[PDB]
């Protein structure tokens, strides 16, 4: 029956979106747990697209039994979601190359997600609008994923194996790891249950696609814009946490409440603006260009919203907190006598508002146990929690949240037009190949690369490493400058190309 297939496919869309969100929100926890850099985390993130690419070319040439193959794909999604959860049981207790299992689980999840989109619409249109409703129901998945991630990032990583009354660290600390594994396991089981109710010439067209200058210009433009979007959304949680002193759970919840309603209303507003005012193709291009310009201006607005580097004695200041400075920092007399491994990540700030690296490096000699230190020579009383962010950074964070809402809304309106502004410029009998080649280019060159080379620069901005393991303190000014300048340099040539596109598209003959 068609109704049963519709329900099963809706559940499959929900599971796909939930798995994507679960993977996206857990990245920083993976970096902390496995002591890996952000470039490696970006590689793990792009392994999903790698797995999708390894199998999309096959399905694109074979159709067999579509419901059975979709069920197999969702089963592989669940298996990949659980494989990534397995290192929790296969590892020891977290202490404040196992990431290969996470990488392969993400790859398996991508291989499983590949069948659902093409085979689903093939079965939908073969036996009989539906795609929009399916996307609307799949929009439920992000909701569930964001809620579960926000709930699980505030539960300790070793929950159920420790008494939890002995955990010294807090979610606001830079060593906290949540229960990301649970989120992954829940997504895996949901995908498995979604799987259950299921088993019940060319190169000449390729040349033409390229010989089309408008198609090539639009492909480069969409590639740049989508790469910027992917590189921004991959590290938006991490950037918020490391820039505005927010916990992982709070960041996940706030980014979810920012994204879900905005995306839900943008997917509709962008497609309603065209049909309501009867936009021509050049009108659609101008619409998308204006949305891109507004988004670019808002991205420019992020630059003044950069909180300064925290006053840390040893990285941004001298060890006594007297002068400013981050490598090979010399020892002050008050600190030289109390020698320390010079590598003790023990965030403990002083009432001076200056964070110190460790109680030994702060010159503290006595401890209360809430922990308070006494007779800290170079602190001129301490507190084990590192000094938090300043009101000014809090107001900047509020402005950042508002601008993020507006930017997310504008992004959806601009995106919906893109696909509609890449097929209407291609022959009707060749639109399928145009969509497929555009999908391969954007998914490969953005999903596989943008996380990696964004994370490489992010690591370049790091100021304190663990063990190198996971970054401890990020240079906030450098972090913001790199994280926003990369997006700006990816979006500006896209704008120059848009005008070129508008300049060239207009003079064309349109029937």
């Amino acid at each position: 029956g068609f109704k049963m297939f519709l329900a099963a496919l809706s559940f499959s869309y929900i599971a796909k979106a939930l798995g994507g969100i679960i993977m996206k929100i857990s990245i920083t926890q993976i970096e902390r747990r496995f002591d890996i850099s952000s470039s490696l985390a970006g590689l793990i993130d792009g392994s999903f697209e790698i797995g999708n690419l390894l199998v999309i070319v096959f399905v694109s040439y074979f159709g067999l039994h579509r419901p059975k193959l979709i069920g197999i794909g969702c089963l592989l999604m669940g298996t990949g979601s659980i494989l990534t959860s397995l290192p929790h049981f296969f590892m020891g207790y977290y202490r404040y190359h196992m990431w290969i299992y996470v990488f392969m689980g993400n790859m398996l999840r991508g291989i499983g997600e590949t069948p659902i989109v093409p085979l689903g619409i093939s079965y939908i249109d073969d036996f009989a609008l539906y795609l929009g409703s399916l996307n609307a129901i799949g929009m439920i998945g992000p909701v569930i994923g964001f809620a579960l991630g926000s709930l699980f990032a505030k539960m300790y990583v070793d929950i159920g194996y420790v008494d939890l009354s002995t955990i010294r660290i807090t979610p606001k600390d830079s060593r906290w790891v949540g229960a990301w594994w649970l989120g992954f396991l829940v997504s895996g089981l949901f995908s498995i249950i979604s799987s259950i109710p299921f088993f019940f010439g060319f190169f000449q067209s390729l040349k033409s696609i390229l010989t089309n200058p408008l198609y090539v210009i639009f492909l480069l433009l969409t590639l740049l814009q989508v790469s910027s979007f992917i590189g921004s959304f991959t590290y938006v949680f991490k950037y918020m946490e490391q820039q505005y002193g927010q916990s992982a759970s709070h960041a996940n919840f706030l980014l979810g409440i920012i994204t879900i309603p905005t995306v839900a209303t943008g997917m509709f507003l962008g497609g309603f603006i065209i049909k309501k005012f009867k936009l021509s193709l050049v009108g659609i291009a101008k619409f998308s260009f204006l949305t891109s310009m507004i988004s670019f201006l808002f991205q420019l607005l992020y630059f003044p919203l950069i909180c300064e580097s925290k006053s840390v004695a040893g990285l941004t200041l001298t060890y006594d907190g007297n002068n400013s400075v981050h490598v090979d920092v010399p020892l002050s007399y008050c600190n030289s006598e109390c020698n320390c491994d010079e590598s003790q990540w023990e965030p403990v700030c002083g009432n001076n508002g200056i964070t110190y690296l460790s109680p030994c490096l702060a010159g503290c000699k006595s401890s209360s146990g809430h922990t308070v230190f006494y007779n800290c020579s170079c602190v001129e009383s301490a507190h084990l929690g590192e000094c938090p962010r300043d009101n000014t950074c809090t107001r900047k964070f509020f402005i950042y949240v508002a601008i993020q809402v507006i930017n997310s809304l504008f992004s959806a309106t601009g995106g919906t037009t893109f696909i509609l502004l890449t097929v209407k410029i291609v022959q009707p009998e060749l639109k399928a190949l145009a969509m497929g080649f555009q999908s391969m280019v954007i998914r490969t060159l953005g999903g596989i690369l943008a996380p990696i080379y964004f994370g490489a620069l992010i690591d370049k901005t790091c100021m304190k490493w663990s063990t190198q393991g996971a970054c401890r303190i990020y240079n906030s000014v450098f972090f913001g400058r790199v994280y926003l300048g990369l997006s700006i340099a990816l979006r500006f040539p896209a704008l120059v190309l848009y005008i070129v596109f508008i300049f060239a598209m207009k003079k064309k003959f349109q029937g």
Partner: antibody
Amino acid sequence: EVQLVESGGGLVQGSLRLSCAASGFNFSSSSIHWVRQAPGKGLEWVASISSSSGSTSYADSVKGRFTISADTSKNTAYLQMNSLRAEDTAVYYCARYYIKRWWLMSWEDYSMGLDYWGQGTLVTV
Amino acid sequence: IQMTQSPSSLSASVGDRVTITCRASQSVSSAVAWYQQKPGKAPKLLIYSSLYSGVPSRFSGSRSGTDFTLTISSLQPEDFATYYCQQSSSSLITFGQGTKV
């Protein structure tokens, strides 16, 4: 080296498929237009099509019995007639708009008049 | 959308000024073209208010808003053919009547 060769002109009692093979320019950023010239009469526009997409334009006299297509790979454009009554016995030209070739970027400009025509096929009814 | 040339037949000598004027009745736009069609040949684009490359510097086009006019400084024996003014809008192509000799 822009060329536009038309072939397919023959006596018909009716239907006929005529072609406008192109060369010397990027076919994708171009358009093809058919012009009818009755013997002793003036030029008359018949149909038009864009090569980058499926966009077509048609004339009032020929809408319900004239079809125009284009094969990008073949680098040619095609025109179809049906129900050939005794009023389409003219000579058929094929023409393209002007194309600018700054660097390797090729784009047409409809504001510019046809800069390259065809020889023409005589259709007899 | 529609353009018509009143002069049509126009006889003149070697040293003479030729003026061909046609008016855009509907949907006026600056996209006007001038074609010279020798008997039994394909038309040739001349004015289109800019000189096409390879055309001698004696053809000129002008317009006051509706009066599109093609002028020849001297009528040489080599341009005793028919002339057409052409409106090339988007999705629409129209032609005049024809001005010969």
